[PDB]
Design a protein around this ligand. Sequence first.
Ligand SMILES: [Cl-]
Length: 293
Amino acid sequence: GIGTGFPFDPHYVEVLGERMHYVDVGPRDGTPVLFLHGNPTSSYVWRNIIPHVAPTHRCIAPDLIGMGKSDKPDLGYFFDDHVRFMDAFIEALGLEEVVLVIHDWGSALGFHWAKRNPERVKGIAFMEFIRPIPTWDEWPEFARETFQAFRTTDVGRKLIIDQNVFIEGTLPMGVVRPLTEVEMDHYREPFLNPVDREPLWRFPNELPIAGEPANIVALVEEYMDWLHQSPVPKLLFWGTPGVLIPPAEAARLAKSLPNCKAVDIGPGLNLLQEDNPDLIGSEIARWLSTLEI
Ligand SMILES: [Cl-]
């Protein structure tokens, strides 16, 4: 069965005055593979994928600021805050060239960093990634009213901050197979106190949906423009029915994005890592062996 444990030795680095935790396993030389999680997860979401890659490549998986075992400064936790912290995390570890493996808000961070630093990105593996959602009709109907309610300061904060719905509800509805109590407890751990749930509510308020927020839409459109032109090697995982990336969108992208290979993981919603970690891990490892790294 799918592993529930998190055996990785903790590492911490100081980044803009705050401590960030990260996983760091695998051989010291070579090009490192940088795994970036999204909302409402942490490096825990990569626990069953990293073991396929760590035999042959260094795997670095940070916890975003305010998440996982990272510190919880009093921020708004805008996407811009995550950009500043991830930029400085990357520099604090002295990373030069990397391969990215990215998901959800980690994908916005990784594509935005790669577009700004294309010489330092040797490949991107991505899944269930942030793209502009043109209208609410392109958000999955089964989740539409709740995401609309999340994007308010009254109902949305009641649900996500007071009641922890992003953890208790949205996270299971983003995984096809059932999550076990131990897994739920690993995801709950950083957010036991309601005040620490700020990032969980700011993230859905930052999603580029129906033109809002305009600044995030523009930034995401720009990295998608880059992705459609850049020769960077690309590996796209997708599932059925997906959430951010429906199967037809994935098929489009695989042919449209240069140097892109698509992998169907089977049934999946948003956290594809929880529905088929062994395929995702093994395919990343295989794909890495084809890159000039
Ligand atoms: Cl979100």
